[PDB]
Design a protein around this ligand. Structure first.
Ligand code: AN2
Ligand code: AN2
Lengths: 218, 234
């Protein structure tokens, strides 16, 4: 349903917007080296949220495939999550984003808005389900004519019995450790399949998780 | 026929409203961010003032999102309701204690108010979900204070009948038009035209209904209002 999806999907961009506005208010507005770049991101997130409301309201049409540089696009996503982490209430370096991208530029046909939603949910999960903190490792590679993204955490894991169930709508693992609706990964799977790709997960209950996304390369 | 239709119409309206209400702050943000990007950011007389407004608009949307999410969770049957036997007197008194304590600090207070308590003497043990019900009392108490005249008295009652536990919360503010006594519990209904979503009482009505109870309001314009909560007793 519309309300539930739009509400769920606005949360990461609102957090990201809040985070950059906070950095600006805290003094970055005085720094000519960074203020314009920060303002540019808030302008982009605000416009993205406005498109998102409309898109999701209309579905109750466009899957807009563009040839995109995944390297840059993934990098832009992770830049926001670093900003969320720095303006976080946690101690500095309580969470780390380590990037492991191949050096060649990878061009892939995607819907930029919808796929950002996918990366947002997985990064946000990777953080939300590491309460004790940790490194989030983000990999970008091409092999066997697939472009593959994997996102690993050192968080709470996922029971083996539930590895399949986690992409189902409303499914939330019911053990100790919060969350919300159980929609993020179902929305994500829907987008990834729509784009001709695949998503899957490996996990160890005490160690952490790795989510994988595969997209057709050429 | 009409039954399914009324439902579908309410849903269609609610969706339309959600889209308009999320859109309006974002549109306001866009306008302040664009002024900032066009150069106001270099200007110390306005950049801080402008940033502050974007921060407030952003907070309002995050509250709206959280509120819309609870409404969804309940609409889904997904919402966890944990009925436990608790002392309503001590729970209500603690709620009022948080509000008295707010006033105890010189802000300066914008407005002074008094919280008058009239509780029954016997202890009322009743099964409820404390986390959710405290939220309900908060929403009514915040309204009661917000719409009180300077120096107004907020009167809080806990009384039981043979069949019911009744809580009432009265203010001496401008009250509510008779045409609207029902509508104030509607999603996004605000009689007025700053922050405030118009979802609080909609959440409250839904929560009180999950708990097996009833909530309603009496008001005489210019007199003030009295909100009631009824809970099944024993
Ligand atoms: N990175 C992760 N580590 C451990 N558990 C995770 C995880 N990412 C997702 N999960 C689990 O999968 C369930 C469903 O995820 P999701 O669709 O994104 O739900 P959500 N967080 O939007 O409420 C979550 O409730 C959580 O139990
Ligand atoms: N105690 C009260 N006195 C006068 N009007 C009241 C009132 N409590 C609620 N109302 C009216 O009902 C409307 C909706 O209440 P509510 O759902 O709590 O709004 P809110 N606080 O989330 O923005 C308010 O805007 C107000 O017009």
């Amino acid at each position: 349903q519309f309300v539930s999806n739009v509400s769920h999907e606005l949360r990461t961009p609102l957090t990201s917007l809040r985070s950059y506005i906070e950095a600006l208010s805290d003094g970055a507005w005085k720094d000519p080296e960074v203020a314009p770049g920060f303002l540019k991101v808030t302008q982009e997130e605000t416009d993205r949220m406005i498109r998102m409301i409309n898109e999701l309201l209309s579905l109750s049409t466009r899957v807009d495939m563009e040839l995109v540089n995944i390297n840059e696009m993934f990098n832009y996503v992770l830049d926001r999550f670093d900003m969320i982490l720095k303006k976080d209430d946690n101690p500095a370096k309580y969470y780390t984003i380590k990037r492991e991208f191949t050096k060649r530029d990878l061009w892939v046909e995607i819907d930029t808005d919808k796929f950002t939603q996918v990366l947002d949910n997985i990064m946000n999960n990777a953080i939300k389900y590491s309460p004790d903190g940790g490194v989030v490792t983000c990999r970008l590679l091409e092999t066997h004519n697939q472009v593959i993204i994997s996102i690993s955490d050192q968080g709470l894991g996922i029971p083996r019995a539930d590895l399949g169930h986690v992409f189902d709508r409303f499914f939330r693992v019911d053990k100790a450790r919060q969350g919300g609706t159980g929609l993020g990964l179902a929305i994500s799977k829907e987008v990834v399949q729509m784009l001709g790709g695949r998503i899957w997960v490996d996990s160890v209950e005490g160690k952490g998780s790795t989510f994988y996304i595969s997209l057709p390369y050429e």
